[PDB]
């Protein structure tokens, strides 16, 4: 999977582009990005500090004025948040910044997180948690999370990983949600908490119709299924669905801190199936082999979900062997969804 991310790096502009009809700025390629910068501010190879999409850069008119235009408040806190655009014509996502107007990073490194030594911060769409009345405990310290790395940050590794194959899904707008078996015990949890179960609470009836503590008894291994419950109440139902119901993407072995490869969560989703816990999958689509651009990957990432008359958030890529994965967030998609 992933960690958590590096909001602002120390990066090196790739291959510079002119953008028509608007020559005081032009187009700049940071490794998998293309962001807009102003004439001259870069040549390729220069050092500049990248703020990714999503970061939040509270006002300041000495290192941020080209922010000054896009203040929002936030969290009680005003700031700009990155977000894709448009301007001029050009797909933008992100900031670029030289290098010469941070002198505390003269010091540092290409690849260096300086997230917190700028003081930006995540960004995130409003999300209702649970309440503390159903709060079981802390997600469990033995279970990994669910993000991945974006595609248009492993540059290199698209090249060194060709050839390969890999399951590719469609990845879904849902709230995280995990059911899980240590040995006596079976859970089921929201993204950062575990919850108790009442008749009401929304993961335990979606477990419960599903009947995957049921499965869980049956496997008779601790195991944490992954997923997440989408439809309606839940951030947008973008897919438009009736009820609700949980998908799940990843399995792992608590036993063995790591994940099913595709064909073995493959092999245990059937066998669920077979037995009758009907558990659902994201939608899985044909493996490919890797042979790819950055850029042209993403152009799959456009596409239909699992409503099919619905645009898709992306897709995931976890090769077989599952010692690599990454998702490409379709940019149709996000350019669409403002408050995505």
Not at 289 to 294: D, M
Request: glycine share 8%; charged share 30%; hydrophobic share 35%.
């Amino acid at each position: 999977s992933m960690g958590v991310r590096k909001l602002a790096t120390i990066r090196t502009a790739g291959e510079i582009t002119p953008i028509a009809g608007a020559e005081a700025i032009e187009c700049c390629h940071v490794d998998g990005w293309t962001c807009v910068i102003k004439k001259g501010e870069f040549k390729q190879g220069d050092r500049g500090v990248y703020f990714e999409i999503d970061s939040f850069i509270k006002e300041d008119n000495d290192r941020y004025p080209m922010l000054s235009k896009q203040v929002i408040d936030y969290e009680g806190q005003r700031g700009t948040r990155l977000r894709t655009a448009r301007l001029r014509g050009q797909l933008s996502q992100g900031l670029f910044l030289p290098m010469d107007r941070f002198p505390e990073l003269a010091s540092n490194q290409v690849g260096d997180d300086v997230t917190e030594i700028l003081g930006i911060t995540k960004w995130e769409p409003p999300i209702s948690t649970n309440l503390s009345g159903e709060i079981l405990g802390e997600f469990p310290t033995f279970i990994s999370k669910t993000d991945q790395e974006r595609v248009q940050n492993l540059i290199p590794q698209i090249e060194e990983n060709k050839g390969q194959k890999f399951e590719v899904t469609v990845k879904l707008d849902g709230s995280s949600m995990t059911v899980y078996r240590k040995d006596d015990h079976i859970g089921v949890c929201g993204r950062n908490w575990e919850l108790r179960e009442t008749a009401t609470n929304a993961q335990w009836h979606a477990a419960r119709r599903n009947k995957m503590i049921e499965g869980l008894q049956f496997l008779n291994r601790n195991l944490a299924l992954q997923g997440a419950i989408i439809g309606e109440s839940i951030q947008g139902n973008l897919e438009k669905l009736k009820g609700q119901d949980f998908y799940l993407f990843d399995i792992y072995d608590i036993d063995k801190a790591q994940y099913l490869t595709p064909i073995e969560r493959q092999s245990l989703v059937k066998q669920l199936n077979d037995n009758g816990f009907t558990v659902k999958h994201v939608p899985i689509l044909d493996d490919l082999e890797l042979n790819h651009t950055a850029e042209q990957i993403l152009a799959m990432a456009d596409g239909p979900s699992l409503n099919k008359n619905v645009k898709r958030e992306g897709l995931v890529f976890k090769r077989l062997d599952g010692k690599f994965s990454f998702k490409a967030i379709s940019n149709a998609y996000l350019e669409k969804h403002k408050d995505r």
